[PDB]
Design a protein around this ligand. Structure first.
Ligand SMILES: NCC(=O)N[C@@H](CO)C(=O)NCCCC[C@H](N)C(=O)O
Length: 517
């Protein structure tokens, strides 16, 4: 943290914040959700980290170079240590990245390093070659060489993501699946695990072994797993939470803008709210049925329920304000809702679903006051607009994510946040082979377009190819886009270091401090 001169720090340097749900795991290779990453960024530090403006900055790697954006050499700082006193070495990153792509690890972020296209990754992920063939090697203890199969100038932006953090070989081989237990875990972040009580709290305490511990201010941070946005807000107002989750309850947000405007932060957020179609669950294997759902959803009615936050209606998957995206709105977005509804009922009727023989689907969503309200709305809209019956199923955050991977759902409330500020961070999730493809979308045409992005001469072509992928995704109605997120949360006036200028919202407890109150 960088405390401004003249600012008086408080006696007690503690922070409470709501994470929004109970985390999948504290194992960096066993997570895929934003809540999981919020804790991982405090516990584990990768090669690069996000600065206050969201730009890649030095982490364990103090400098780095590249040749043709193909061979990346990372120079690791020599005072980089684990929580057991052992130094963080290039070998840790070889082991860690080899583990992440091991079929036996079964990481949901297995395909992440495949977005960087590290040498020999393709055959390793499908279990044809061994993990030791991966194009990452320890040239020495403090020098890591990453060899890629094609040029990727945005490779370095990937390396802020927790699924790219080092993981301690000793602890994992000693404790197995018990390696993240409070007493056992070994961390290289600014914090280590003090306590973990399921559905109550995760307590981290400042790790003195951290190389930059001299600049850490917050001694202890608590993450709460409160799914109810109403309860989060109420506990914040009762003075028990310092920072809410960035999910605001539809009903109270207008009240909160009026009463505590100074404490209400709303900033750009590279995430898309959408209704994810299981493309392999009948009748959603039919593109006509999928298109009927896409058109039959009224975004304007839905967006007007969250108007106070100022969400823009969504016409695609990749946020158009994503760095290197010049997206075009599809013709159907320009139509009236009455015209979308007619065309949707026609397309349904072609597939043999009419008023007389109706379509009944299950809309899955993760426990939430925001998601329940917008689901009831969406359910009602689809019923009046295109005569589709929509029953609501709710599950806890962990089960929700599992259900979508297994493909045991019809349509799920979905929300993707960019891991790095580049359209591939989104678009690569819809690749046939991607471990993050919970849509189960398989288009050789879409895969072909994305493969073409790595054979490009200038960035102007790369941007155009991304727009063609978004168009193909839209033509195949892979998803029902609803609205592009904003980063809206409540932050007590005594919490400093939160600027909200990072559009990925990759904040670190080590960057924050408590002003006297
Ligand atoms: N790039 C990581 C990501 O976007 N992961 C998804 C998971 O598929 C996620 O965490 N997304 C964030 C949206 C869900 C988080 C919150 N609890 C809510 O439901 O509001």
């Amino acid at each position: 943290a960088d405390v401004p001169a003249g600012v008086t720090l408080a006696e007690k340097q503690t922070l409470v914040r709501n994470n929004g749900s109970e985390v999948q795991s504290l194992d960096p290779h066993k997570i895929e959700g934003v809540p999981e990453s919020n804790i991982s960024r405090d516990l584990f530090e990768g090669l690069l980290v996000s600065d206050l403006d969201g730009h890649p900055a030095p982490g364990v790697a103090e400098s780095w170079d590249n040749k043709d954006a193909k061979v990346w050499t990372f120079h690791l700082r020599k005072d980089a240590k684990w929580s057991d006193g052992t130094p963080v070495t290039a070998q840790d990153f070889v082991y860690s990245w080899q583990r992440s792509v091991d079929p036996n690890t079964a990481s949901p972020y297995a395909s992440y390093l495949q977005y960087g296209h590290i040498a020999g990754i393709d055959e390793i992920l499908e279990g044809k070659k061994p993990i030791t063939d991966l194009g990452v090697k320890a040239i020495d203890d403090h020098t890591l060489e990453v060899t890629l199969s094609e040029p990727v100038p945005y490779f370095y932006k990937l390396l802020v993501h927790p699924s790219t953090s080092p993981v301690p070989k000793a602890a994992i081989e000693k404790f197995g699946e018990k390696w993240t237990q409070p007493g056992n875990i070994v961390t290289n972040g600014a914090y280590t695990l003090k306590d973990w009580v399921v559905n109550e709290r995760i307590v981290l305490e400042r790790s003195p072994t951290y190389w930059n511990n001299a600049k850490t201010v917050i001694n202890q941070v608590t993450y709460l797993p409160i799914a109810s946005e109403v309860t989060d807000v109420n506990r914040y107002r009762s003075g028990e939470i310092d920072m809410t989750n960035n999910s605001m309850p539809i009903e109270l947000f207008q009240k909160l803008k009026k009463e505590i405007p100074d404490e209400v932060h709303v900033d750009p957020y590279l995430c898309t709210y959408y209704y994810e179609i299981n493309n392999q669950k009948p009748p959603f294997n039919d593109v006509r049925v999928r298109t009927a759902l896409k058109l039959g959803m009224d975004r304007d009615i839905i967006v007007n329920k969250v108007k106070a936050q100022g969400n823009m209606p969504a016409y695609g998957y990749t946020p158009p304000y994503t760095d290197g995206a010049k997206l075009t709105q599809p013709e159907w977005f320009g139509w009236s809702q009455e015209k979308r509804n007619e065309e949707a009922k026609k397309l349904l009727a072609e597939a043999g679903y009419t008023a007389d023989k109706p379509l009944t689907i299950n809309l899955l969503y993760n426990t939430s006051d925001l998601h329940k309200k917008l689901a009831i709305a969406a359910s009602s809209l689809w019923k009046k607009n295109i005569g589709v019956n929509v029953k609501l199923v709710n599950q806890e955050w962990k089960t929700f994510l599992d259900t979508r991977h297994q493909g045991t759902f019809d349509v799920a409330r979905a929300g993707w946040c960019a891991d790095y500020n580049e359209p591939t961070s989104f678009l690569n999730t819809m690749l046939s082979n991607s471990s993050m493809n919970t849509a189960h979308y398989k288009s050789p045409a879409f895969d072909s377009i994305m493969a073409e992005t790595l054979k490009v001469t200038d960035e102007a072509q790369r941007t155009a190819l991304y727009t063609k992928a978004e168009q193909q995704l839209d033509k195949d109605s892979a998803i029902v886009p609803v609205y592009y997120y904003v980063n809206a949360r409540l932050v007590k006036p005594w919490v400093g270091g939160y600027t909200g200028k990072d559009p990925l919202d990759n904040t670190y407890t080590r960057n924050m401090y408590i002003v006297k109150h």
